[PDB]
Design an enzyme around this catalytic site. Structure first.
Site, PDB file in Angstrom:
ATOM      1  N   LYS A  36       1.074  -1.936  -0.185  1.00 49.53           N
ATOM      2  CA  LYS A  36       0.058  -0.024  -0.146  1.00 49.53           C
ATOM      3  C   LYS A  36       0.882   0.945   0.131  1.00 49.53           C
ATOM      4  CE  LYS A  36      -1.362  -0.559   4.021  1.00 49.53           C
ATOM      5  NZ  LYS A  36      -0.178  -1.902   3.976  1.00 49.53           N
ATOM      6  N   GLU A  73       2.710   6.068  10.392  1.00 49.76           N
ATOM      7  CA  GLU A  73       3.314   4.877  10.345  1.00 49.76           C
ATOM      8  C   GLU A  73       4.577   5.194  10.642  1.00 49.76           C
ATOM      9  OE1 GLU A  73       1.257   3.213   9.714  1.00 49.76           O
ATOM     10  OE2 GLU A  73       3.325   1.076   9.292  1.00 49.76           O
ATOM     11  N   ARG A  74       5.765   5.074   9.851  1.00 52.98           N
ATOM     12  CA  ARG A  74       6.862   4.918  10.821  1.00 52.98           C
ATOM     13  C   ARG A  74       7.997   5.864  10.132  1.00 52.98           C
ATOM     14  NH1 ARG A  74       8.497  -0.634   6.861  1.00 52.98           N
ATOM     15  NH2 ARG A  74       6.277  -1.240   8.002  1.00 52.98           N
TER      16      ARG A  74
HETATM   17  N1  LIG Z   1       5.671  -3.235  -6.861  1.00 53.13           N
HETATM   18  C1  LIG Z   1       5.999  -4.377  -6.417  1.00 53.13           C
HETATM   19  N2  LIG Z   1       7.641  -4.963  -6.841  1.00 53.13           N
HETATM   20  C2  LIG Z   1       8.180  -5.652  -5.866  1.00 53.13           C
HETATM   21  N3  LIG Z   1       7.950  -6.037  -4.649  1.00 53.13           N
HETATM   22  C3  LIG Z   1       6.688  -4.731  -4.173  1.00 53.13           C
HETATM   23  C4  LIG Z   1       5.802  -4.238  -4.810  1.00 53.13           C
HETATM   24  N4  LIG Z   1       5.233  -3.670  -3.815  1.00 53.13           N
HETATM   25  C5  LIG Z   1       5.564  -4.179  -2.788  1.00 53.13           C
HETATM   26  N5  LIG Z   1       6.393  -4.769  -2.962  1.00 53.13           N
HETATM   27  C6  LIG Z   1       6.719  -5.487  -1.703  1.00 53.13           C
HETATM   28  O1  LIG Z   1       5.741  -6.150  -1.273  1.00 53.13           O
HETATM   29  C7  LIG Z   1       6.243  -5.026   0.377  1.00 53.13           C
HETATM   30  C8  LIG Z   1       5.413  -4.050   1.196  1.00 53.13           C
HETATM   31  O2  LIG Z   1       5.264  -3.388   2.181  1.00 53.13           O
HETATM   32  P1  LIG Z   1       5.321  -1.447   1.951  1.00 53.13           P
HETATM   33  O3  LIG Z   1       4.714  -1.674   0.391  1.00 53.13           O
HETATM   34  O4  LIG Z   1       6.706  -0.923   2.026  1.00 53.13           O
HETATM   35  O5  LIG Z   1       3.851  -1.110   3.221  1.00 53.13           O
HETATM   36  P2  LIG Z   1       2.670  -1.790   3.203  1.00 53.13           P
HETATM   37  O6  LIG Z   1       3.727  -3.592   4.865  1.00 53.13           O
HETATM   38  O7  LIG Z   1       2.089  -1.081   3.903  1.00 53.13           O
HETATM   39  O8  LIG Z   1       2.794  -2.561   2.532  1.00 53.13           O
HETATM   40  C9  LIG Z   1       7.650  -4.133   0.150  1.00 53.13           C
HETATM   41  O9  LIG Z   1       9.186  -3.744   0.954  1.00 53.13           O
HETATM   42  C10 LIG Z   1       8.168  -5.419  -1.064  1.00 53.13           C
HETATM   43  O10 LIG Z   1       9.055  -6.043  -0.666  1.00 53.13           O
HETATM   44 MG   LIG Z   2       3.033   0.744   4.907  1.00 58.14          MG
END
Ligand SMILES: Nc1ncnc2c1ncn2[C@@H]1O[C@H](COP(=O)(O)OP(=O)(O)O)[C@@H](O)[C@H]1O
Ligand SMILES: [Mg+2]
Ligand SMILES: Nc1ncnc2c1ncn2[C@@H]1O[C@H](COP(=O)(O)OP(=O)(O)OP(=O)(O)O)[C@@H](O)[C@H]1O
Ligand SMILES: Nc1ncnc2c1ncn2[C@@H]1O[C@H](COP(=O)(O)OP(=O)(O)O)[C@@H](O)[C@H]1O
Ligand SMILES: [Mg+2]
Ligand SMILES: [Mg+2]
Lengths: 471, 52, 502, 187, 468
Positions: free
Chosen positions: E156, E182-183
């Site tokens: 997200k 959030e962090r």
């Molecule tokens: N478009 C993408 N391509 C590859 N990996 C992704 C993608 N979107 C998210 N991820 C993986 O999923 C995780 C999502 O965590 P993040 O988006 O930072 O916060 P949340 O836990 O709110 O989703 C990321 O650390 C990444 O490893």
């Molecule tokens: Mg997040």
């Protein structure tokens, strides 16, 4: 008037009154002054410092604190007698049909006690209604108690208005319909379905039914006491006159369920899933006054709503013991077009007995139910193996079982506005003979569409000739 | 659509000018308040008369 | 400007003794008031700043009061006054074509509504004598509704389903489709409409007045609006106020219609408003009388007899359910108040059946079968030909071949399934429905392809309105499809099928 | 049980339980106008850095706060039914709420001849010719053989009027009437 | 000095305070005297006989009873204006960038009302982003609210770092970001990625974005009110300057999670699974101010959290009535590798319509949901029985709907540092053209490993050209 109390706390539909001189007992009636309508409050608890906790029977709008409250000296006193026939009546015993007042000479207070152990008639009979699932598989009894289960939209106002046609016109004794909280639309059909059918006569004194109607547009303290105004008119016909009565109540789940709407406002801790903690006590106080003593008889038919098709709910599952005969309508059967929806493997009576119905009626209805439980073990094989993998004996089972399932269906007379068919009324001697032959093999050579919606088995071969001529 | 929008912007300003100017005009008076009290007595003298 | 000065000379400065209760607390909307001796229950009380409220609980020490507005202008030590009236809203035909809030003040800005009569929001449903059975039809213009699940006038029908499946659009094609009767001549075929918006943001209700004003639909409706920003006692009062403008029509002769969008948001405004009054929770923290909340509402939808006026009041409550589960607490309490239902699904919407109506489960107590005479002919046989289809048409894996036996019947369903699909904000008529349904059941489409029937429909429909206008006027006037009228239609479908694809 | 005389206030809470058990007990034997003179003398000996040091002390003993006040309540002036009442509150554990009961008994005994005074809230004070009317035209309302009382509190946010509250009446005539000119801006 | 008060009771972050005259009206501010920092108490209730109950914005440790409390006269006000750009603030509007004070001419209160009915704007358009799942199936608008529902660990905020990287570069007006609960290291890498890329200008007045921050270390009287702070700096840039502002909120669930932590101690009976009794009136008072109106246009993008991966929980499932678009993400999708793990069956819009999105696009939209549903409706039979007991027409909605799932995954620009693959932006007209050549059946010989993690459709035949 005595103990002219005063109102202190109107929280919902639970009014508390405070008496200066004379405290009234539990289960009385109180009369709120200064209103153009009649509002009746019934005492339920004694709190200390001469305040009681009542329950209104009407709307609690316009209740200003410090308002006087009279006292009558008894519970609610309704009219009763022979002149209450062909009438519709309120919970506190009033006319709601705009025909004038009820002129009777005898009143009955609606709180009485269950008759004792030494006033219990023991005999069983049979009762024939005309339906091939009632009369074959869960037969009634003259004086028994009969409950119609099943969910919403499965056929309970039709199956209860068809038995009013079948039994309650060819009957010498009287009948009472008590409407405990249902649709006010459906309480206008049965008032007019029985004016043209002679059961109510609006000019002379030869009507044979009495109506009690408090519907689901009513506050939930008045939807708990039309179950008791019913079996107070339906007890004067059994005890005082030595007659025979029929009791029709729809719906009796709204008696329990309207006791859970004022439980916590009274001051109790709620029990399991949300019901009051006095479920099986206020119910069994009422379902023991519907019995046949040695002064008369009562044949009671009550519709029982099962909420969300959940039979293990505590409001239906504590009603399975106050009844002799259960007819349980399912919904997975009425989706196949089969009507009446009655489940063959879940209905049950007490008199299914080789010493009352005979040892030919018994051997039939224990082979219909045995071939329908043999069907379901094959339906799990068909879903994987398909139909043309089975052996030649098991194919014979499915064909008869689908012939029996279609033959249990029957066109009622009140489906002459829904389906356009014509109605049947099958006698008992033909019902046993017809089902005896499908199990034997004497109709193995017909299509299944002959058997759908016929009466006797001789009409199910007069259809297989018309299908072959129009081919 | 220009005729109507310039009426709406003018209408709200015309209201607040009459409203914000009456706050100081009612605050400054010191002789008419004694006139205002005796009629406030006479209204209350009239008020209890129609009750009883 | 002359308008401001004439508003200030008409103002009446009347003064009288009030009856007055000092405030003891104010938090989250509840104002426990010391004093207020002779107050009624459900009376409307009026705070000092201009706010308004309704005294629910009576108690010996305090008096519980909930606020119609905002609780930040109210400080401990304030003054609560007495109006002297159980809570009432204005009523009439003068509200027609407006958007109003839950107490009858206009939020459109066309001015003050000139209304003359006031009617309570807590009145009583009529009983057993002053009704009659359901004689008339109510046409929606949907083709899966009018043929298979018809709706009479005076019958409570429940539109139930998930979020984003079609529950609002179904009840807005119904608002549009009565345009043709309302500019007609007889006063007994009209249908005046009402929409109640509960818990909806203002960037949906100001957008639905746009869709209802290009088609000129807004000249015969009212919109009672209690948005998600409103006080929780204003989302509770909204359907009891909207239903009480419906009973100006029904108690004077005409025919009304009312949509509650939705009634799962009139329940969580009762759960919150009556937890802060310290009332003990029931199941899912709902109060004891959520069944009594919905039942005393849905029984005013009557159909009066002809010695009172004969007017009707349909109702169409919308209910949103979670994950398509119908056995929840608030769904099952309102399934068993309504005569019939319309089960909207999601896998119908996405496979392609739009409006996504489960015609298998959409049962209806048919309303004395007031479908109409000509539709009974073509949709009587359609109902059975579709029911024959659904028992036998769910394999998706074929191994054997029975074109004389089975494949003829399932070819009649896909021609009648793809006929039942519709567009959006373009509802048909009933004789334009009899024509297109005639051509489907009489075998006149089994030589097409199913990917061309939606294209076949609009070319057919434009040909009959243009070249055959005196044909369709004998179906609408005479009611039935006569045998000589059966004759004329037999060529038109075949003459058009001779030159459809060329 | 027996029936009791109705106090003309009927307050609630932990005060009005004990402050009606005292009104009903003293209205028997017609000990009403006397007992208020005795309750105003315990209303002075309660505020003492040796008496109030253990009338609200938890940790003395459950028992020795009963003999210490019973010896105190009898010797100095009085031995009526109040000597049982102080022994009744102390036997139960309600010694903390003892000033609450006498402030509750006072408002209950005041209405036997009193008025629950009005509150004129206008401005800087006035002369004698405009006040002795409002101390007499406010007597023309009630008319039940009574001798009126009053409070005054000055507030300037009310710009040009006076509000008054005979009981729970509130006849308001002030500068709220600027907010009532919203109807000029309200179409 | 309108009023003076003394602390009477202290339970966590709900300080009780008794005044003597001059009761403060509800949602004023109170100033606690005798502390090293600023401690501001905001009045919540009125508990009877000159006593209020307040909720504190900073920590309450070290308070004693009798400690004095002073009355401000007004709610929490923050400095708003064009000098707020490039500055970071907290809940009471003090500079936490250590670059000195914020000097504006005017101040804006935190609490204001909602817009009326007759100040709404109905005009809808399409904001083309550059993501295939959003352009085709669920198109965003230009002036409408957007939600990104998702669990914990689905994406997200990588998805919200794209709609900055694609929309806030080509924007002409201003921008506002808010961080609610959030962090804090993620709130540091947005400062050292907008200074490097010219959006923050430390040396003059040519900066575009504002920032507002209350993170997951605060007391829960601050997380419950930091979202009304960035909502006020993004209204001055709408009503009084007349711009077209963006607004990015992450995360808006913590407005509600940290409102059922101070609702137990105010004396309230709890509703269902543990939430406050007023769950859905405080949300409809925060969300009813984030609107496009007749005076400007706010294009909201809010990230929303679903608790324990449940969409029927009362905190996510009451946000749905406040949106226009919707992008429900999923966990089991992202176990396969489809990133952005968008659920194509659960995501909606209000502008997907044949007259708005164009009648050619609307038929590739509804026609690709039809082939996707029919793959779902046979998963009972394929899992038990096998692929090999199917017909020949329904081995051609299975093989065509596995080429379509893989052709919805796109490499993002912000994700180059993770996997080392170039971020691709596709235009709108090259996705409609590229799905009609999977629905008509032109690529039925290419395998399914070629439609995976590519940009425009010509890379799919190029990836198929590589493996041979
Ligand atoms: N478009 C993408 N391509 C590859 N990996 C992704 C993608 N979107 C998210 N991820 C993986 O999923 C995780 C999502 O965590 P993040 O988006 O930072 O916060 P949340 O836990 O709110 O989703 C990321 O650390 C990444 O490893
Ligand atoms: Mg997040
Ligand atoms: N007849 C139709 N054919 C095809 N699509 C339709 C039709 N009617 C509505 N839709 C589309 O379905 C979507 C949802 O419709 P609608 O908004 O009425 O659903 P809803 O369940 O009322 O939404 P909410 O859950 O927000 O109340 C809309 O995008 C609309 O454009
Ligand atoms: N002969 C029949 N058998 C089964 N159902 C029927 C028959 N005739 C009509 N029905 C339909 O079945 C429905 C049953 O509903 P009904 O019995 O009236 O109420 P309930 O919900 O109490 O079962 C009716 O709406 C009616 O449309
Ligand atoms: Mg029924
Ligand atoms: Mg909707």
């Amino acid at each position: 008037g005595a103990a002219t109390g005063r109102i202190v706390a109107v929280i919902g539909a639970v009014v508390d009154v405070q008496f200066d001189e004379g405290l009234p007992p539990i289960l009385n009636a109180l009369e709120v002054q200064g209103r153009e309508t009649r509002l009746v409050l019934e005492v339920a608890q004694h709190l200390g410092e001469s305040t009681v906790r009542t329950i209104a029977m009407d709307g609690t709008e316009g209740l200003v604190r410090g308002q006087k409250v009279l006292d009558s000296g008894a519970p609610i006193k309704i009219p009763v007698g022979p002149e209450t026939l062909g009438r519709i009546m309120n919970v506190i015993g009033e006319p709601i049909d705009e025909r004038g007042p009820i002129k009777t000479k005898q009143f009955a207070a609606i709180h009485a006690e269950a008759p004792e152990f030494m006033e219990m008639s023991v005999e069983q009979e049979i009762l024939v209604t005309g339906i091939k699932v009632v009369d074959l598989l869960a037969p009634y009894a003259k004086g028994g108690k009969i409950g119609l289960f099943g969910g919403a939209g499965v056929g309970k106002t039709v199956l209860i208005m068809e038995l009013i046609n079948n039994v309650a016109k060819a009957h010498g004794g009287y009948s009472v319909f008590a409407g405990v909280g249902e649709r006010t639309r459906e309480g206008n059909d049965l008032y007019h379905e029985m004016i043209e059918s002679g059961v109510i006569n609006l000019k002379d004194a030869t009507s044979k039914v009495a109506l009690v109607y408090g519907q689901m547009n009513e506050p939930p303290g008045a939807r708990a006491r039309v179950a008791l105004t019913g079996l107070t008119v339906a007890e004067y016909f059994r005890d005082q006159e030595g007659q025979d009565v029929l009791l029709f109540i729809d719906n009796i789940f709204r008696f329990t369920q309207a006791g859970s709407e004022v439980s916590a406002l009274l001051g109790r801790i709620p029990s399991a899933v949300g019901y009051q903690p006095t479920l099986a006590t206020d119910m069994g106080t009422m379902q023991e006054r519907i019995t046949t003593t040695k002064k008369g008889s009562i044949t009671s038919v009550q519709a029982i709503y099962v909420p969300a098709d959940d039979l293990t709910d505590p409001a239906p599952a504590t009603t399975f013991a106050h009844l002799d005969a259960t007819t349980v309508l399912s919904r997975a059967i009425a989706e196949l077009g089969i009507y009446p929806a009655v489940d063959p493997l879940d209905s049950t009576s007490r008199i299914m007995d080789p010493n009352i119905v005979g040892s030919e009626h018994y051997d039939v209805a224990r082979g219909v139910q045995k071939i329908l439980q043999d069907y379901k073990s094959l339906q799990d094989i068909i879903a994987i193996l398909g139909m043309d993998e089975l052996s030649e004996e098991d194919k014979l089972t499915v064909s008869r079982a689908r012939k029996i399932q279609r033959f249990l269906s029957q066109p009622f007379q009140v489906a002459e506005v829904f389906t356009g068919h014509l109605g049947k009324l099958v006698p008992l001697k033909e019902t046993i003979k017809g089902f005896q032959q499908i199990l034997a093999g004497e109709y193995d050579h017909l299509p299944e569409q002959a058997f759908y919606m016929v009466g006797p088995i001789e009409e199910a071969v007069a259809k297989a000739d018309k299908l072959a001529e129009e081919h | 659509s220009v005729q109507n929008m310039m009426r709406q912007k003018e209408q709200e300003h015309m209201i607040r000018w009459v409203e914000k100017h009456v706050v100081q005009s009612i605050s400054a008076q010191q002789e008419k308040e004694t006139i205002a009290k005796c009629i406030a007595d006479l209204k209350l003298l009239a008020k209890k008369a129609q009750a009883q | 400007s002359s308008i401001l000065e004439e508003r200030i000379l008409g103002a009446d400065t009347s003064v009288d003794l009030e009856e007055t209760g000092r405030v003891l607390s104010i938090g989250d909307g509840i104002a426990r008031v010391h004093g207020l001796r002779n107050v009624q229950a459900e009376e409307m009380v009026e705070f000092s700043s201009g706010l308004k409220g309704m005294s629910l609980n009576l108690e010996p020490d305090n008096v519980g009061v909930v606020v119609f507005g905002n609780d930040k202008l109210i400080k401990e030590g304030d003054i609560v006054k007495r109006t002297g009236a159980i809570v009432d809203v204005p009523v009439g035909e003068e509200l027609l074509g407006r958007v109003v809030d839950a107490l009858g003040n206009a939020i459109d800005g066309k001015g003050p509504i000139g209304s003359k009569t006031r009617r309570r929001v807590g009145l009583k449903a009529p009983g057993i004598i002053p009704r009659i059975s359901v004689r008339e039809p109510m046409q929606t213009g949907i083709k899966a509704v009018d043929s298979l699940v018809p709706i009479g006038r005076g019958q409570r029908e429940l539109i139930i389903g998930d979020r984003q499946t079609g529950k609002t659009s179904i009840a807005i094609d119904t608002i549009i489709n009565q345009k043709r009767f309302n500019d007609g001549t007889d006063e007994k075929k009209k249908l005046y409409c009402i929409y109640v918006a509960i818990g909806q943001k203002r960037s949906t209700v100001a957008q639905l007045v746009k869709r209802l004003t290009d088609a000129d639909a807004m000249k015969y409706t009212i919109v009672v609006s209690a948005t998600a920003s409103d006080a929780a006692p204003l989302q509770y009062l909204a359907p009891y106020s909207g239903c009480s403008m419906g009973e100006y029509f029904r108690d004077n002769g005409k025919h009304a219609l009312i949509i509650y969008d939705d009634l799962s948001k009139q329940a969580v405004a009762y759960r919150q408003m009556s937890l802060l009054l310290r009332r003990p929770p029931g199941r899912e923290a709902y109060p004891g009388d959520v069944f009594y909340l919905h039942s005393r509402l849905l029984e005013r939808a009557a159909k009066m007899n002809d010695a009172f006026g004969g007017g009707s009041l349909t109702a169409l409550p919308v209910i949103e359910t979670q994950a398509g589960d119908v056995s929840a607490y608030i769904p099952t309490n309102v399934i068993s108040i309504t005569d019939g239902q319309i089960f909207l699904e999601t896998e119908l919407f996405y496979k392609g059946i739009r409006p996504a109506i489960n015609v298998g489960l959409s049962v209806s107590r048919v309303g004395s079968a007031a479908q109409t005479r000509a539709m009974k002919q073509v949709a009587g046989t359609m109902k059975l030909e579709l029911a024959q289809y659904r028992e036998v048409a769910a394999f998706a894996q074929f191994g054997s071949d029975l074109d004389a036996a089975t494949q003829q019947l399932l070819s009649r369903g896909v021609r009648l399934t793809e006929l039942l699909k519709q567009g959006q904000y373009a509802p048909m008529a009933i004789e334009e429905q009899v024509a297109v349904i005639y051509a489907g059941v009489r075998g006149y489409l089994d030589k097409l392809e199913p990917s061309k029937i939606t294209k076949f429909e609009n070319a057919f429909l434009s040909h009959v309105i243009s070249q055959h206008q005196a044909l369709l006027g004998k179906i609408r006037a005479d009611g039935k499809i006569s045998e000589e009228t059966d004759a004329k239609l037999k060529e038109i479908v075949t003459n058009f099928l001779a030159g459809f694809e060329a | 049980f027996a029936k009791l005389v109705r106090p003309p206030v009927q307050i609630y809470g932990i005060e009005g339980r004990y402050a009606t058990a005292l009104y009903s007990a003293a209205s028997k034997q017609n000990k009403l106008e006397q007992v208020e003179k005795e309750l105003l003398r315990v209303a002075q000996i309660l505020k003492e850095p040796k008496v109030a040091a253990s009338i609200m002390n938890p940790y003395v003993k459950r028992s020795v706060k009963v003999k210490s006040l019973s010896d105190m309540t009898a010797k100095e002036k009085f031995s009526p039914l109040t000597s049982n009442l102080i022994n009744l509150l102390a036997e139960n554990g309600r010694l903390s709420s003892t000033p609450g009961v006498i402030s509750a008994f006072s408002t209950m005994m005041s209405v036997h001849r009193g008025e629950v005074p009005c509150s004129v809230t206008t401005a800087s004070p006035l002369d004698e010719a405009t006040l002795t009317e409002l101390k007499t035209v406010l007597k023309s309302f009630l008319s039940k053989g009574q001798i009126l009382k009053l409070e005054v509190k000055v507030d300037p946010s009310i710009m040009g009027g006076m509000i008054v509250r005979i009981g729970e009446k509130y006849v308001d005539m002030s500068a709220k009437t600027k907010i009532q000119k919203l109807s000029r801006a309200m179409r």
